[PDB]
Amino acid sequence: TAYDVILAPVLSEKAYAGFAEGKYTFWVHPKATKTEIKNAVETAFKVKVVKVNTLHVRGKKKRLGRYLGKRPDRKKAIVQVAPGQKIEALEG
Amino acid sequence: SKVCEISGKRPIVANSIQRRGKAKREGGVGKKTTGISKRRQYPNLQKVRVRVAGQEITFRVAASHIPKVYELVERAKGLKLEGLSPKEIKKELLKLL
Amino acid sequence: RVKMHVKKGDTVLVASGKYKGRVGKVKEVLPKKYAVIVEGVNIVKKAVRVSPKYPQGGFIEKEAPLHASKVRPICPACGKPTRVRKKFLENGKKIRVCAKCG
Amino acid sequence: SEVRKQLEEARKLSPVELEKLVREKKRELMELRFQASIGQLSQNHKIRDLKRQIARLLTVLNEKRR
RNA sequence: AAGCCUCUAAGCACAACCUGCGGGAACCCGUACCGCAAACCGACACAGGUGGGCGGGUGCAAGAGCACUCAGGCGCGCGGG
RNA sequence: UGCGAAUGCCGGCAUGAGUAACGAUAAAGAGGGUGAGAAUCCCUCUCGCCGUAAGCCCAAGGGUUCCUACGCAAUGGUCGUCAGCGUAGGGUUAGGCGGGACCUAAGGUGAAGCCGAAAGGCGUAGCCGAAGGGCAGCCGGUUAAUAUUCCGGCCCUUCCC
RNA sequence: UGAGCUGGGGCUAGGAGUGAAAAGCUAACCGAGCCCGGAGAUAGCUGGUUCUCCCCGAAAUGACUUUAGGGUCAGCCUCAG
RNA sequence: GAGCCGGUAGCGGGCGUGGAUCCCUGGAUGUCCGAAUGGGGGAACCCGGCCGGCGGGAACGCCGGUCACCGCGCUUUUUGCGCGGGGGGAACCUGGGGAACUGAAACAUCUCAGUACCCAGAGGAGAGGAAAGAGAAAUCGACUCCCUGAGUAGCGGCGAGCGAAAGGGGACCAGCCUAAACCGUCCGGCUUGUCCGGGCGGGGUCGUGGGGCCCUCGGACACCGAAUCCCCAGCCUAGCCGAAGCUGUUGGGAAGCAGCGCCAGAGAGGGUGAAAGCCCCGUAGGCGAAAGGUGGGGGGAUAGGUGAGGGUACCCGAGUACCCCGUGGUUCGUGGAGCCAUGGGGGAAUCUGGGCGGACCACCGCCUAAGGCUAAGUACUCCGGGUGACCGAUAGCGCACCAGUACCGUGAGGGAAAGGUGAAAAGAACCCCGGGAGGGGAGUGAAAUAGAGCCUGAAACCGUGGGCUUACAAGCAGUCACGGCC
Ligand SMILES: [Mg+2]
Ligand SMILES: [Mg+2]
Ligand SMILES: [Mg+2]
Ligand SMILES: [Mg+2]
Ligand SMILES: [Mg+2]
Ligand SMILES: [Mg+2]
Ligand SMILES: [Mg+2]
Ligand SMILES: [Mg+2]
Ligand SMILES: [Mg+2]
Ligand SMILES: [Mg+2]
Ligand SMILES: [Mg+2]
Ligand SMILES: [Mg+2]
Ligand SMILES: [Mg+2]
Ligand SMILES: [Mg+2]
Ligand SMILES: [Mg+2]
Ligand SMILES: [Mg+2]
Ligand SMILES: [Mg+2]
Ligand SMILES: [Mg+2]
Ligand SMILES: [Mg+2]
Ligand SMILES: [Mg+2]
Ligand SMILES: [Mg+2]
Ligand SMILES: [Mg+2]
Ligand SMILES: [Mg+2]
Ligand SMILES: [Mg+2]
Ligand SMILES: [Mg+2]
Ligand SMILES: [Mg+2]
Ligand SMILES: [Mg+2]
Ligand SMILES: [Mg+2]
Ligand SMILES: [Mg+2]
Ligand SMILES: [Mg+2]
Ligand SMILES: [Mg+2]
Ligand SMILES: [Mg+2]
Ligand SMILES: [Mg+2]
Ligand SMILES: [Mg+2]
Ligand SMILES: [Mg+2]
Ligand SMILES: [Mg+2]
Ligand SMILES: [Mg+2]
Ligand SMILES: [Mg+2]
Ligand SMILES: [Mg+2]
Ligand SMILES: [Mg+2]
Ligand SMILES: [Mg+2]
Ligand SMILES: [Mg+2]
Ligand SMILES: [Mg+2]
Ligand SMILES: [Mg+2]
Ligand SMILES: [Mg+2]
Ligand SMILES: [Mg+2]
Ligand SMILES: [Mg+2]
Ligand SMILES: [Mg+2]
Ligand SMILES: [Mg+2]
Ligand SMILES: [Mg+2]
Ligand SMILES: [Mg+2]
Ligand SMILES: [Mg+2]
Ligand SMILES: [Mg+2]
Ligand SMILES: [Mg+2]
Ligand SMILES: [Mg+2]
Ligand SMILES: [Mg+2]
Ligand SMILES: [Mg+2]
Ligand SMILES: [Mg+2]
Ligand SMILES: [Mg+2]
Ligand SMILES: [Mg+2]
Ligand SMILES: [Mg+2]
Ligand SMILES: [Mg+2]
Ligand SMILES: [Mg+2]
Ligand SMILES: [Mg+2]
Ligand SMILES: [Mg+2]
Ligand SMILES: [Mg+2]
Ligand SMILES: [Mg+2]
Ligand SMILES: [Mg+2]
Ligand SMILES: [Mg+2]
Ligand SMILES: [Mg+2]
Ligand SMILES: [Mg+2]
Ligand SMILES: [Mg+2]
Ligand SMILES: [Mg+2]
Ligand SMILES: [Mg+2]
Ligand SMILES: [Mg+2]
Ligand SMILES: [Mg+2]
Ligand SMILES: [Mg+2]
Ligand SMILES: [Mg+2]
Ligand SMILES: [Mg+2]
Ligand SMILES: [Mg+2]
Ligand SMILES: [Mg+2]
Ligand SMILES: [Mg+2]
Ligand SMILES: [Mg+2]
Ligand SMILES: [Mg+2]
Ligand SMILES: [Mg+2]
Ligand SMILES: [Mg+2]
Ligand SMILES: [Mg+2]
Ligand SMILES: [Mg+2]
Ligand SMILES: [Mg+2]
Ligand SMILES: [Mg+2]
Ligand SMILES: [Mg+2]
Ligand SMILES: [Mg+2]
Ligand SMILES: [Mg+2]
Ligand SMILES: [Mg+2]
Ligand SMILES: [Mg+2]
Ligand SMILES: [Mg+2]
Ligand SMILES: [Mg+2]
Ligand SMILES: [Mg+2]
Ligand SMILES: [Mg+2]
Ligand SMILES: [Mg+2]
Ligand SMILES: [Mg+2]
Ligand SMILES: [Mg+2]
Ligand SMILES: [Mg+2]
Ligand SMILES: [Mg+2]
Ligand SMILES: [Mg+2]
Ligand SMILES: [Mg+2]
Ligand SMILES: [Mg+2]
Ligand SMILES: [Mg+2]
Ligand SMILES: [Mg+2]
Ligand SMILES: [Mg+2]
Ligand SMILES: [Mg+2]
Ligand SMILES: [Mg+2]
Ligand SMILES: [Mg+2]
Ligand SMILES: [Mg+2]
Ligand SMILES: [Mg+2]
Ligand SMILES: [Mg+2]
Ligand SMILES: [Mg+2]
Ligand SMILES: [Mg+2]
Ligand SMILES: [Mg+2]
Ligand SMILES: [Mg+2]
Ligand SMILES: [Mg+2]
Ligand SMILES: [Mg+2]
Ligand SMILES: [Mg+2]
Ligand SMILES: [Mg+2]
Ligand SMILES: [Mg+2]
Ligand SMILES: [Mg+2]
Ligand SMILES: [Mg+2]
Ligand SMILES: [Mg+2]
Ligand SMILES: [Mg+2]
Ligand SMILES: [Mg+2]
Ligand SMILES: [Mg+2]
Ligand SMILES: [Mg+2]
Ligand SMILES: [Mg+2]
Ligand SMILES: [Mg+2]
Ligand SMILES: [Mg+2]
Ligand SMILES: [Mg+2]
Ligand SMILES: [Mg+2]
Ligand SMILES: [Mg+2]
Ligand SMILES: [Mg+2]
Ligand SMILES: [Mg+2]
Ligand SMILES: [Mg+2]
Ligand SMILES: [Mg+2]
Ligand SMILES: [Mg+2]
Ligand SMILES: [Mg+2]
Ligand SMILES: [Mg+2]
Ligand SMILES: [Mg+2]
Ligand SMILES: [Mg+2]
Ligand SMILES: [Mg+2]
Ligand SMILES: [Mg+2]
Ligand SMILES: [Mg+2]
Ligand SMILES: [Mg+2]
Ligand SMILES: [Mg+2]
Ligand SMILES: [Mg+2]
Ligand SMILES: [Mg+2]
Ligand SMILES: [Mg+2]
Ligand SMILES: [Mg+2]
Ligand SMILES: [Mg+2]
Ligand SMILES: [Mg+2]
Ligand SMILES: [Mg+2]
Ligand SMILES: [Mg+2]
Ligand SMILES: [Mg+2]
Ligand SMILES: [Mg+2]
Ligand SMILES: [Mg+2]
Ligand SMILES: [Mg+2]
Ligand SMILES: [Mg+2]
Ligand SMILES: [Mg+2]
Ligand SMILES: [Mg+2]
Ligand SMILES: [Mg+2]
Ligand SMILES: [Mg+2]
Ligand SMILES: [Mg+2]
Ligand SMILES: [Mg+2]
Ligand SMILES: [Mg+2]
Ligand SMILES: [Mg+2]
Ligand SMILES: [Mg+2]
Ligand SMILES: [Mg+2]
Ligand SMILES: [Mg+2]
Ligand SMILES: [Mg+2]
Ligand SMILES: [Mg+2]
Ligand SMILES: [Mg+2]
Ligand SMILES: [Mg+2]
Ligand SMILES: [Mg+2]
Ligand SMILES: [Mg+2]
Ligand SMILES: [Mg+2]
Ligand SMILES: [Mg+2]
Ligand SMILES: [Mg+2]
Ligand SMILES: [Mg+2]
Ligand SMILES: [Mg+2]
Ligand SMILES: [Mg+2]
Ligand SMILES: [Mg+2]
Ligand SMILES: [Mg+2]
Ligand SMILES: [Mg+2]
Ligand SMILES: [Mg+2]
Ligand SMILES: [Mg+2]
């Protein structure tokens, strides 16, 4: 289920800029708690997590003619890997 | 809740009829009605404090069925519970079947 | 669910329409539109895609579907209605003369 | 088809082992996601199979506990 | 009313609470932008309405007044004759 | 089952009419740029108006309106190359800020209990209830867009052992 | 500086509330809010009532009527025998 | 039984005769809210206790499980355990409450009306139901429902108006359990007993009165038998088989016309380029369930049921009958006012007892109150189906179309518009003008004033062209004449 807490990497200039320091950002499950995301990343990428920052990302309203709807709400975690470590899976 | 705990008599609805004129059976042209309106008739509810086992029990009953409380008090047989012996004295001991 | 009386393999003859008479192998069956595509009713699509793959190319000549009713199956004879016969497993389409394909 | 085999393999195979196997496919899935995430680095139909395959183990796990 | 301090009761007093040091642990929600207004209440990019804080300088008896002005912001979403 | 009328009903199109008006009399001018197209977008200079504001920061309420790229059919009282508009992508980071694993206020709810044809109405404690009480973060740097939230420096709180 | 103004949180309402009293106000019309319903209330009043041809063709008086611009009987029109 | 990964093409991939998609049955999973039920709360959020697990894991967090309240029953008030309730449902049903407009051509009794509506409760139905009944016949026999009786009998400011029952004809069909006397038993109270009381069992259930107890006869294999259990048929929830035509011709297209045929337990109907019994789907006629539901039908069990005579006088439902006051129900509006119901007061009896036959009395009869259950015939239609001298997009549901939506309203609530190219997208490559839009050729088509603001395309309304006409004439605009010009 730890591979259920972590959904996908957030791919953006801002996100990439985070790699410089030990800071990797992920799309996580919206109900997932900071404490849960530590362990989730801890056991997913064999790393020591030290700080966890999260924030909700409201869905953007979009229409396709006549019918207007909304995209799913999301949650981003920016995770702080311990000094010297690295997620190689994201370094690409 | 203006209802007898023993007979179950509860308030009923009845008309108040205003009649006037001399009866026909008295050489009058007959009676005339100047109004009919609804009203309640409540049963003559009263308190009955009666000591049972070690406890004081209070029944809200129609004056008519007060005797029934004391008859229900005669039936005695092991019961050191709370102020809720009536729960036992009640229908449990009323007609049961 | 859309009975349908001819399959991919079958050898059908176009019983009516413009290609009345022609005989062909049904390439595709389309139960949703209740239609089959054989070798008759083919048309001229204006192939825009000058830009993507298929450059220059002005047109194309794909074969359009046919109301499934517009065709009939055949075998050592003309077209047939279909009769279904029970064996000792399950049934099979036999024409009103012999049998239909291996 | 290729599936009935896996179903037979899964059945008759401990719950602890089943949970192990699930946790595994669950991880593979995450990887399928990340590939798809960075686009052009995946081939759909696999995300569905696996997702649906993880369901099959979990339902057999259910039987074996029921 | 709690935090807080003190008092003692059951209990417990190789517990416990107090002080100091050390290591570790510290969750959920909000956070964009508008906000005297074209983004809020008034069918409108509506001369109306909307609570708290800051609100510089010079002069004028004083002042948040008046005139001119900093920072900053505007010439108001049809124009020409 | 026959419509011309019901200030009839629904719809369409007329007249007034190229008429009133284009929403504060704070105010405009030129050069250059972009572009199919420019009084209306960009830049420069000059001019004018606000300045206890028409500047700035909070709380409501609003809910993508935010930043950027590509766009002008419509929305914009004109025009638009521009936009708070269309498409797409990005953007909101907290033990210390606010609220909650704190407190109580009016009031609300309500074990006990009381009352009422039914629905239900009361009501002690308790509980809920805040812009009140309580409680530990100040100065800078950084992004197109967040920062007492990220970073840097210095500084504290509670919990567990 | 006061019977002052104002944010936030609350309570009171339809024959009811609230009112330093105007029958004021109770969501832009209050001598009794709004919504749905009884409901197609009732309207002796007003308006409207749709193809064609043929024959005949009135009344606006009398009686009574809480009746008087409404009716009942008669009078006058028409049809059948 | 050959195609499939919904509407939905496409990009990018996959699956299927080793039987996929799809359909039916059963199961699994089923976040959060909601009766909502650990506790809060501004529903879909927030915060916990206990046991167990996961992470380095005490602090933190997550996962599984468990914890609301009320009732009944056991049980030792202990403290637990078990069982159940709660909420929803188109209309239908019963109960508790209960209007007004209106009608009376005013209005109060009366009416509207026990309607609307509110509340509680029930279930596929609900109510009712086995005579303390009817009511004049020595009569009938539970209840419900229809027809009739009958707009009768009556009620009524005797106004407006309201309006029974018996009886007859039908549908359906059914009858049972208890309380008490008496007997046994367990238990509790005590002023200890052939005592009282509660709990269970037996007993008993009736109106030609029945039962208890005592005696006599003879009291049984039986005989009846479920509304309960069991089995089965049948039915519902997917399906399957299902006759008989080719050719020519006009045409874009045949099913039209023509030539010879054929089926019919099938000549209902709908498709296919136009008008098809015989091309497609069906139709007549048959067939079909592993699984779940049903099962009122057949079968089988079980519960249960069944005697005569004599004596005894033990029992036969109490704050009840009965009477009176206040009211409701009935057609009965106080009437000569009974009957059924009952808020208040008084207050019995147990077959020689009690109620009723419309005040009361007598006589003659009917029936056995104060406990309970009971299928079917009946009501409704959210739902599935079949039919139409039913609608056909201003109709028909508000909605043929992603409508209880957009939008309006603080809210309860209100509430629309909006269908159609073609047989087939063959939905117009390319070229020209243009920034696009749009158009012009080309091309598709039987048709392109069928080009997607697409079938037909009326009227108002706006244009372009042409004929006649008009700047010394004046009027409901027409009409009758003449004359010109086209
Ligand atoms: Mg946060
Ligand atoms: Mg009276
Ligand atoms: Mg007399
Ligand atoms: Mg009345
Ligand atoms: Mg008495
Ligand atoms: Mg045939
Ligand atoms: Mg098979
Ligand atoms: Mg406290
Ligand atoms: Mg001390
Ligand atoms: Mg001690
Ligand atoms: Mg420390
Ligand atoms: Mg730390
Ligand atoms: Mg921020
Ligand atoms: Mg900000
Ligand atoms: Mg602005
Ligand atoms: Mg601002
Ligand atoms: Mg202002
Ligand atoms: Mg301000
Ligand atoms: Mg501003
Ligand atoms: Mg403006
Ligand atoms: Mg304004
Ligand atoms: Mg505005
Ligand atoms: Mg003013
Ligand atoms: Mg102000
Ligand atoms: Mg100052
Ligand atoms: Mg100054
Ligand atoms: Mg000064
Ligand atoms: Mg001077
Ligand atoms: Mg001065
Ligand atoms: Mg100041
Ligand atoms: Mg000033
Ligand atoms: Mg300036
Ligand atoms: Mg302006
Ligand atoms: Mg007319
Ligand atoms: Mg009209
Ligand atoms: Mg239109
Ligand atoms: Mg004018
Ligand atoms: Mg003018
Ligand atoms: Mg003007
Ligand atoms: Mg102006
Ligand atoms: Mg220039
Ligand atoms: Mg240029
Ligand atoms: Mg200029
Ligand atoms: Mg310029
Ligand atoms: Mg300007
Ligand atoms: Mg806000
Ligand atoms: Mg937007
Ligand atoms: Mg912007
Ligand atoms: Mg731009
Ligand atoms: Mg535009
Ligand atoms: Mg424009
Ligand atoms: Mg414009
Ligand atoms: Mg405007
Ligand atoms: Mg441009
Ligand atoms: Mg935009
Ligand atoms: Mg910090
Ligand atoms: Mg701030
Ligand atoms: Mg806090
Ligand atoms: Mg905590
Ligand atoms: Mg509190
Ligand atoms: Mg209360
Ligand atoms: Mg209550
Ligand atoms: Mg209650
Ligand atoms: Mg709290
Ligand atoms: Mg506070
Ligand atoms: Mg505070
Ligand atoms: Mg704080
Ligand atoms: Mg500091
Ligand atoms: Mg900013
Ligand atoms: Mg800063
Ligand atoms: Mg810092
Ligand atoms: Mg004061
Ligand atoms: Mg105030
Ligand atoms: Mg009122
Ligand atoms: Mg008042
Ligand atoms: Mg006042
Ligand atoms: Mg007002
Ligand atoms: Mg009515
Ligand atoms: Mg009236
Ligand atoms: Mg005539
Ligand atoms: Mg004449
Ligand atoms: Mg009149
Ligand atoms: Mg007359
Ligand atoms: Mg004659
Ligand atoms: Mg799809
Ligand atoms: Mg494909
Ligand atoms: Mg293949
Ligand atoms: Mg099979
Ligand atoms: Mg299923
Ligand atoms: Mg299931
Ligand atoms: Mg809860
Ligand atoms: Mg634990
Ligand atoms: Mg849990
Ligand atoms: Mg129930
Ligand atoms: Mg219910
Ligand atoms: Mg309820
Ligand atoms: Mg009732
Ligand atoms: Mg009722
Ligand atoms: Mg009730
Ligand atoms: Mg009633
Ligand atoms: Mg009335
Ligand atoms: Mg009438
Ligand atoms: Mg009247
Ligand atoms: Mg009248
Ligand atoms: Mg009147
Ligand atoms: Mg009545
Ligand atoms: Mg109900
Ligand atoms: Mg039935
Ligand atoms: Mg029934
Ligand atoms: Mg019953
Ligand atoms: Mg009986
Ligand atoms: Mg009888
Ligand atoms: Mg009389
Ligand atoms: Mg009546
Ligand atoms: Mg009868
Ligand atoms: Mg009969
Ligand atoms: Mg019978
Ligand atoms: Mg005894
Ligand atoms: Mg007994
Ligand atoms: Mg018995
Ligand atoms: Mg018995
Ligand atoms: Mg006897
Ligand atoms: Mg067939
Ligand atoms: Mg056939
Ligand atoms: Mg030809
Ligand atoms: Mg032919
Ligand atoms: Mg022929
Ligand atoms: Mg037939
Ligand atoms: Mg045609
Ligand atoms: Mg046709
Ligand atoms: Mg024909
Ligand atoms: Mg014909
Ligand atoms: Mg046919
Ligand atoms: Mg023929
Ligand atoms: Mg059949
Ligand atoms: Mg079969
Ligand atoms: Mg069958
Ligand atoms: Mg079965
Ligand atoms: Mg049977
Ligand atoms: Mg049987
Ligand atoms: Mg037996
Ligand atoms: Mg005997
Ligand atoms: Mg005897
Ligand atoms: Mg009896
Ligand atoms: Mg009597
Ligand atoms: Mg009497
Ligand atoms: Mg009476
Ligand atoms: Mg009465
Ligand atoms: Mg009277
Ligand atoms: Mg009378
Ligand atoms: Mg009477
Ligand atoms: Mg009466
Ligand atoms: Mg009598
Ligand atoms: Mg009576
Ligand atoms: Mg009584
Ligand atoms: Mg007698
Ligand atoms: Mg009688
Ligand atoms: Mg008599
Ligand atoms: Mg009397
Ligand atoms: Mg009788
Ligand atoms: Mg009985
Ligand atoms: Mg029943
Ligand atoms: Mg239906
Ligand atoms: Mg038709
Ligand atoms: Mg329409
Ligand atoms: Mg319609
Ligand atoms: Mg039409
Ligand atoms: Mg409907
Ligand atoms: Mg409509
Ligand atoms: Mg819809
Ligand atoms: Mg609105
Ligand atoms: Mg709204
Ligand atoms: Mg159309
Ligand atoms: Mg079509
Ligand atoms: Mg067609
Ligand atoms: Mg060009
Ligand atoms: Mg063209
Ligand atoms: Mg052409
Ligand atoms: Mg052609
Ligand atoms: Mg043509
Ligand atoms: Mg053309
Ligand atoms: Mg045409
Ligand atoms: Mg057209
Ligand atoms: Mg056409
Ligand atoms: Mg059109
Ligand atoms: Mg057509
Ligand atoms: Mg057209
Ligand atoms: Mg012209
Ligand atoms: Mg002259
Ligand atoms: Mg002249
Ligand atoms: Mg003139
Ligand atoms: Mg004239
Ligand atoms: Mg002439």
mmCIF file of C-alpha atoms (C1' of nucleotides) in Angstrom, chain E:
data_model
loop_
_atom_site.group_PDB
_atom_site.id
_atom_site.type_symbol
_atom_site.label_atom_id
_atom_site.label_comp_id
_atom_site.label_asym_id
_atom_site.label_seq_id
_atom_site.Cartn_x
_atom_site.Cartn_y
_atom_site.Cartn_z
ATOM 1 C "C1'" A E 1 -13.628 28.894 31.908
ATOM 2 C "C1'" A E 2 -9.174 26.647 31.084
ATOM 3 C "C1'" G E 3 -3.825 27.321 30.951
ATOM 4 C "C1'" C E 4 -1.117 28.458 35.730
ATOM 5 C "C1'" C E 5 0.202 28.097 41.273
ATOM 6 C "C1'" U E 6 -0.783 26.031 45.703
ATOM 7 C "C1'" C E 7 -3.566 22.320 48.941
ATOM 8 C "C1'" U E 8 -4.447 17.868 50.153
ATOM 9 C "C1'" A E 9 -8.068 12.474 48.746
ATOM 10 C "C1'" A E 10 -8.199 7.951 46.965
ATOM 11 C "C1'" G E 11 -3.984 5.514 45.539
ATOM 12 C "C1'" C E 12 1.456 4.890 45.108
ATOM 13 C "C1'" A E 13 5.586 5.673 47.510
ATOM 14 C "C1'" C E 14 12.550 0.237 44.007
ATOM 15 C "C1'" A E 15 6.000 4.747 41.935
ATOM 16 C "C1'" A E 16 5.278 9.322 40.792
ATOM 17 C "C1'" C E 17 5.946 14.823 40.296
ATOM 18 C "C1'" C E 18 9.818 18.911 40.212
ATOM 19 C "C1'" U E 19 14.829 20.997 37.996
ATOM 20 C "C1'" G E 20 18.829 20.499 34.678
ATOM 21 C "C1'" C E 21 21.196 18.151 30.516
ATOM 22 C "C1'" G E 22 20.862 14.650 26.237
ATOM 23 C "C1'" G E 23 18.633 12.007 22.295
ATOM 24 C "C1'" G E 24 14.365 11.354 19.707
ATOM 25 C "C1'" A E 25 8.994 12.648 18.175
ATOM 26 C "C1'" A E 26 5.834 17.063 16.547
ATOM 27 C "C1'" C E 27 -0.613 15.474 12.891
ATOM 28 C "C1'" C E 28 -5.291 17.654 9.939
ATOM 29 C "C1'" C E 29 -7.133 22.376 7.414
ATOM 30 C "C1'" G E 30 -5.938 27.342 5.179
ATOM 31 C "C1'" U E 31 -1.967 29.879 2.379
ATOM 32 C "C1'" A E 32 -2.738 31.554 -5.497
ATOM 33 C "C1'" C E 33 -5.250 36.102 -6.786
ATOM 34 C "C1'" C E 34 -9.359 40.328 -6.077
ATOM 35 C "C1'" G E 35 -10.539 42.774 -1.636
ATOM 36 C "C1'" C E 36 -13.821 50.820 -0.959
ATOM 37 C "C1'" A E 37 -13.741 46.989 -5.677
ATOM 38 C "C1'" A E 38 -14.200 45.627 -13.374
ATOM 39 C "C1'" A E 39 -12.950 39.671 -9.295
ATOM 40 C "C1'" C E 40 -17.479 41.129 -2.659
ATOM 41 C "C1'" C E 41 -23.678 43.041 -2.149
ATOM 42 C "C1'" G E 42 -26.478 45.879 -6.203
ATOM 43 C "C1'" A E 43 -29.414 41.292 -13.692
ATOM 44 C "C1'" C E 44 -24.196 45.386 -16.016
ATOM 45 C "C1'" A E 45 -16.264 46.400 -16.310
ATOM 46 C "C1'" C E 46 -23.425 49.924 -12.272
ATOM 47 C "C1'" A E 47 -21.027 57.720 -10.072
ATOM 48 C "C1'" G E 48 -24.642 53.396 -4.642
ATOM 49 C "C1'" G E 49 -23.107 49.892 -0.335
ATOM 50 C "C1'" U E 50 -18.847 47.171 2.545
ATOM 51 C "C1'" G E 51 -15.597 46.075 9.034
ATOM 52 C "C1'" G E 52 -9.974 46.574 11.353
ATOM 53 C "C1'" G E 53 -4.686 48.604 10.670
ATOM 54 C "C1'" C E 54 -0.802 52.018 8.129
ATOM 55 C "C1'" G E 55 -1.582 56.521 5.857
ATOM 56 C "C1'" G E 56 5.064 60.628 4.603
ATOM 57 C "C1'" G E 57 6.370 66.308 3.667
ATOM 58 C "C1'" U E 58 5.366 71.942 3.682
ATOM 59 C "C1'" G E 59 2.354 75.720 5.027
ATOM 60 C "C1'" C E 60 -2.213 77.527 7.303
ATOM 61 C "C1'" A E 61 -3.450 78.493 15.723
ATOM 62 C "C1'" A E 62 -4.443 73.039 15.945
ATOM 63 C "C1'" G E 63 -6.095 68.618 13.258
ATOM 64 C "C1'" A E 64 -7.059 62.579 10.038
ATOM 65 C "C1'" G E 65 -9.291 69.727 8.191
ATOM 66 C "C1'" C E 66 -7.577 72.690 3.421
ATOM 67 C "C1'" A E 67 -3.868 73.588 -0.808
ATOM 68 C "C1'" C E 68 0.249 71.593 -3.154
ATOM 69 C "C1'" U E 69 3.121 67.208 -2.963
ATOM 70 C "C1'" C E 70 6.644 61.501 -1.635
ATOM 71 C "C1'" A E 71 6.046 56.564 -2.236
ATOM 72 C "C1'" G E 72 2.699 54.383 -4.986
ATOM 73 C "C1'" G E 73 -1.589 54.600 -8.255
ATOM 74 C "C1'" C E 74 -4.345 56.629 -11.838
ATOM 75 C "C1'" G E 75 -6.442 60.174 -16.850
ATOM 76 C "C1'" C E 76 -12.222 56.661 -15.242
ATOM 77 C "C1'" G E 77 -12.769 51.326 -22.601
ATOM 78 C "C1'" C E 78 -15.595 55.520 -28.289
ATOM 79 C "C1'" G E 79 -13.406 59.237 -30.810
ATOM 80 C "C1'" G E 80 -12.535 63.774 -34.333
ATOM 81 C "C1'" G E 81 -14.618 68.578 -35.145
#
